[PDB]
Amino acid sequence: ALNWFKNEFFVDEWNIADVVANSENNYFTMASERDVDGTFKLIELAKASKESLKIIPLGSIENLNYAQEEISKSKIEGGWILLQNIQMSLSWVKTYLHKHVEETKAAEEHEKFKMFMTCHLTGDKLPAPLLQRTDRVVYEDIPGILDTVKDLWGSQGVWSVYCTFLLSWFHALITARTRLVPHGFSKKYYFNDCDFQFASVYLENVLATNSTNNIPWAQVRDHIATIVYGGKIDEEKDLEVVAKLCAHVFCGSDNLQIVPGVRIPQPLLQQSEEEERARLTAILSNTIEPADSLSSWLQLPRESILDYERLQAKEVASSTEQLLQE
Amino acid sequence: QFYWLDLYGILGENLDIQNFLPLETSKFKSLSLKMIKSSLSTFLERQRRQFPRFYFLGNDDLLKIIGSGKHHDQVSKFMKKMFGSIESIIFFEDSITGVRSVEGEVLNLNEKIELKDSIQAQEWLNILDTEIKLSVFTQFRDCLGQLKDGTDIEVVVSKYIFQAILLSAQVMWTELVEKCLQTNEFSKYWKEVDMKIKGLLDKLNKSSDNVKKKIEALLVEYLHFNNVIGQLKNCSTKEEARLLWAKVQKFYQKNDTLDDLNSVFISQSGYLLQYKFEYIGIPERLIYTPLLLVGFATLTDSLHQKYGGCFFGPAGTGKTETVKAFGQNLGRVVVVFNCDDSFDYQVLSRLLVGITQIGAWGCFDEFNRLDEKVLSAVSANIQQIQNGLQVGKSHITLLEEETPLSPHTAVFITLNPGYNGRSELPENLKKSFREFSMKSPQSGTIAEMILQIMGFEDSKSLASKIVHFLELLSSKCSSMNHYHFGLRTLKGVLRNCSPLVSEFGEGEKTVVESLKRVILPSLGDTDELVFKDELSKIFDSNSKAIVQCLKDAGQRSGFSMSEEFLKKCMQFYYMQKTQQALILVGKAGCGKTATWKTVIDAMAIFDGHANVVYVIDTKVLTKESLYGSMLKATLEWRDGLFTSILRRVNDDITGTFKNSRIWVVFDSDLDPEYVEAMNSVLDDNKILTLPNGERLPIPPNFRILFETDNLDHTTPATITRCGLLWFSTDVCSISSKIDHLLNKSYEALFELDKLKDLISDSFDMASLTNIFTCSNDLVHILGVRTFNKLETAVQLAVHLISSYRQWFQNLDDKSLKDVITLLIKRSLLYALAGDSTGESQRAFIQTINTYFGHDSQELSDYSTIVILSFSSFCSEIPSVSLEAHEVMRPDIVIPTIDTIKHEKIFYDLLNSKRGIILCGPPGSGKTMIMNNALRNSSLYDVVGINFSKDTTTEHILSALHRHTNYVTGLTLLPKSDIKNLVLFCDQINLPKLDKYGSQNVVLFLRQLMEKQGFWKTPENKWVTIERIHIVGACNPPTDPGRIPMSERFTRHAAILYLGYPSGKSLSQIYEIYYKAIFKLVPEFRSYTEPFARASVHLYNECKARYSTGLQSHYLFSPREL
Amino acid sequence: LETAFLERMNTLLANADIPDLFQGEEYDKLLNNLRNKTRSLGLLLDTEQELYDWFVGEIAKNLHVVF
């Protein structure tokens, strides 16, 4: 019901790459909540742009002096410079960075310079004069399951791509499950790109030494449940939930009903890597995420997710009504 | 001649260092010596670059090691710091034949290393490092050769070092289990390993010390082998067997390559790690449990991609020892650091440089204690090290210097989330680590295996009963902070079972005695009952010498040996045998100091060893004074008090500490920002890590005591490491304490003996009991318990009675009894009801007269004794005749009866050398009364301090700068040799609480009163105070902005309450003032009375009408008048 | 600007002097100056106690503070 408005009226939506690529500015401020960080988004951006991105964390005088020197160099010669956790050194954000940005409001005379800043939305206040000059981007997770798996798949021998596809589905499903704090997992947890990357590395390492197609699916399940993702888990109930999801996904069946929608057959060893990638992409793109995916795809009670979803809708609609009255 | 000889041995007799130190060489020749010695740091850094392990030596240590290259004595002494596992170097014929480990194992080298005077330390130490690697590999090779041929395990353990035998056994076990995995035949090999376990276990009982240790560790490893082999034997399918076997560590040797030292590698979960063949000695091995194996799995997975390892969870689950055991399994020793907030970017960067160049694995414990700023800053270095290792770079740049990257390093962090004083890692730093939860260890398996190793008849039953009993205690005891029955408690119990094996016979009796000794001392009455009942329910079923030593010590010191006191002494004595860190928690005045001093004195009697005790007040000192500080401006380390003491003990220049015990008592509140710095000192690491890089070992006979009265802000990180002694109630009765105090006061003094008998008879507990009982019902402003007010009573009574000794020789018995009775009644009155109001004091006088007996000398409101006969102050008030101008003087006091009473009692208390606190509303005349009492004296000078919110110890010490001299421990004396100093503390209760609820200045004053001295921090010396007294004043702790003061301070001072004068009193005083003024205009002197009445009426009505409920500053007092 | 300023002005009105301003050689110098001034005023003050008492008395006499 909420997404109805956005889908019906609005026909476009931008990402980080869209904002950076299409902007007259060259100073960018990224913000997120605790345990969420988009530094890897910036490194992927810089690699895709063939740009040299230097990352400097702030919080000490040594790094600060080095940062001042490197800011001067990156503005005279060019290059991308990232300053992490600027809120840690507000006495310098409000004194040095404040004055310098206005100076570069003035020069606008070098094309290969871009500065990036990260901060926490739950932290201290940044000065408005600096905040209202730079571009601002909020980084957060993709809300949809199919969207998340689609993005992960788009970021990326038939067994390698097949296992990567399964891992992408697994990551999307577990990340979606983390939203239901009182119903999905007992405790709130966060999962990020590093867990996905380690799972991919382990899957590739396993595939490297099992040429017979006798894939040790039990070892894959135990490692992913226990080490890659279970390491963060400090509760037996939540680890059992993770084990259930691993058993569902990495079962090794000939045709997995990974959701009530798409069924994923196993690859044929006679096919090419490009052929299997095309087949998997077609399988992914041809389906539809249902309205009640929070229940059916996560196998949760509907009445449990009802309170969650309805209360979010309540807050959104109440705010909209209050704003519209004024 | 010291400094020249030192710098000559360092700099003088050395013509090789001049190519780097030409200026200092020439400057030394001319010779300032100290400044040249401090200028050698650049060369020391150059020498550190030539041998990375030198980063664990201080500058003085490098100076010594560089200088004495002609003797090779000093280089040996640093092995414990440089390598950790190696105690010393074994020289012979000016060559190295071996090394001696910490446990006493001797490693022989394949070839003797010939030494020359011209060869520097770094050179032949590098040679020695290569030789140790080659020798350990050689013994591994030969031992594996013999074991694979078919040699028995029991005839090889006595020939080779622990590492060789362990790794040969592991490789053979891996190979044979894999061959068994080829089929379903596991029964035969299970039986074979079981027989080997039995053989080694029986051989254990007939062994030397080193062989005993080797066999114990091998038994641990073979028990793990058998458990694994049994599990594989009991798998259902082939796939289950493969799945289980893939998860354990496998030991393979590259028998098909040429590179010898890199031939052995470790496979787990499809990932391979390289075995290092570093010498680690014979450390205690950990029982293998599923949690340990999964931890190893996660660490292996992280190391595959060169990510930092990380363990998180609650305290006491075995994180750091899991890391160390992982390193041990991989043939390397992990360097452990204790993080603190004294670390910053420079310290962590330098430590990372050291770990980088050495090629060592470093574990950072309590990583959360780093402040947020450095946690943000060091993320760049963490990322750079990870990227350098992943890419394969040869150098990395840290602190503006390019340094080589040794491709063997790893970074581990151990952090306890959600504890007081800890912080949170930022996301861009956490993403560089792989976290793993260690929430609950398998205590049952650990207990069972340890008991099986110890040789107990039935390990299974005892392990079940002990663990179940601990769970029942954790479930049934009351809700109190200091109740932790986790793994550390289990280890304490099991370790205490070890010395008691021969006492009780390898059975249940040992276990129950260990349980009692470990657990009962820390329980209350309810939990003591629960413990005893539950222990009786679950389990089925001679100290005379030390008891007599305790009796002798107590009686000689003069403390009554009550049953409770003896019980606590006995519990403390048994606890301190195996615990090097004890905490004593009890109410103020309950007798902790008596307990531990008595027990140490009894131990001194029993053993004949010396006991040196240092008492440190943690809160009064700052951390940079306690643990020392690095001056970054010069990069010069300067020791703190505790660091200085530890360094001096380790040095042991005269050997004075070889037959003695060192006691360090922390006499203040536990503070997580202070005590946690000693975490690696208190636990099994037994090492103090300093920010500069030094690593000071803790001697086995170095014990630490914490004395406090609360555990409010203390985290489990400290409570679960230290043995805890809980004092539920005072250790003695009021009668015993009065007996002690009277004996001490008398002994401090024929005539005195009969006077002692008279005084002791006068202090009849039959009436004092009731007097105390009804004293307990009064209102006490800024009050203290009756038990802690007895000291003032006894001390003042003895002083007062002894003051009249000069006139007792000519008195009859009745006169002596009357004087003693009246003096004791007055002293008791002021001791018990001194802090109450006037009406309360008079009613209490009435009760005193009632209980001492109708036929005793009566005490009245204003009774006194004059030079003997009895009189009253009310008849001894002179009039005053002031001139008009004298109303402007600040030092005029119009006499009155209540003033005279206050002045007399104050001066009497001051003469008795009891600290004084005055309390009353503003303007009541506290400072005026004090000033008037000492203005006309000839014995005391007065120094005044005004306390405030942000005053510190520095202001109080600076206040005495112009009044006192430091005269060589050190002493602090008044400049004048005729008068003492009375240091009056105005508004003592204003200084604010720190973040944990403590007043450092009030604790400093407590130290001045109680210990009669303090620590001088820059020199870390003890300063004794001779002739300085401490008095002070405050408003009651109910006015805004006043901080309640802890009982541990106020118990040391008499408290006198001073209320406002009555209306008639003010009327008379100010009528006298107006009478003085009207001399200017004598024709209006008839109006002196009504003007004073008008002024007092106006004051009263303004005070009543305009209260502070309207405005905060509406305060009215006689000052206005 | 800081609470330390209060910590000074409190002392300065609770007592005539601020001991932290005249420690060590600053004390010695102070005494020397006082001696010279004493000789210049026709007064006979021999000891550091007399000189410092005169110093604080004159301070209390001459200095007024308005907040």
Ligand SMILES: Nc1ncnc2c1ncn2[C@@H]1O[C@H](COP(=O)(O)OP(=O)(O)OP(=O)(O)O)[C@@H](O)[C@H]1O
């Ligand atoms: N597998 C094991 N076998 C035997 N004892 C073990 C084992 N694992 C841990 N222990 C015991 O656990 C304790 C080690 O805990 P450790 O010092 O690592 O705690 P920690 O988690 O670092 O503590 P903290 O959070 O207080 O710093 C020692 O008593 C050690 O004997």
Ligand SMILES: Nc1ncnc2c1ncn2[C@@H]1O[C@H](COP(=O)(O)OP(=O)(O)OP(=O)(O)O)[C@@H](O)[C@H]1O
């Ligand atoms: N057995 C005893 N017989 C007589 N008096 C005793 C006995 N035990 C203790 N006392 C007295 O009780 C008081 C005990 O105080 P102690 O010096 O031991 O410090 P404490 O109770 O640890 O207090 P704090 O922590 O404030 O220093 C002292 O007055 C001591 O004289």
Ligand SMILES: Nc1ncnc2c1ncn2[C@@H]1O[C@H](COP(=O)(O)OP(=O)(O)OP(=O)(O)O)[C@@H](O)[C@H]1O
């Ligand atoms: N004979 C007298 N008896 C009592 N008070 C008197 C007498 N003569 C004068 N006073 C007045 O009594 C007051 C004494 O209080 P004083 O100024 O000494 O307060 P204080 O005890 O230092 O208070 P605070 O705790 O607020 O610092 C002064 O106003 C003094 O003028």
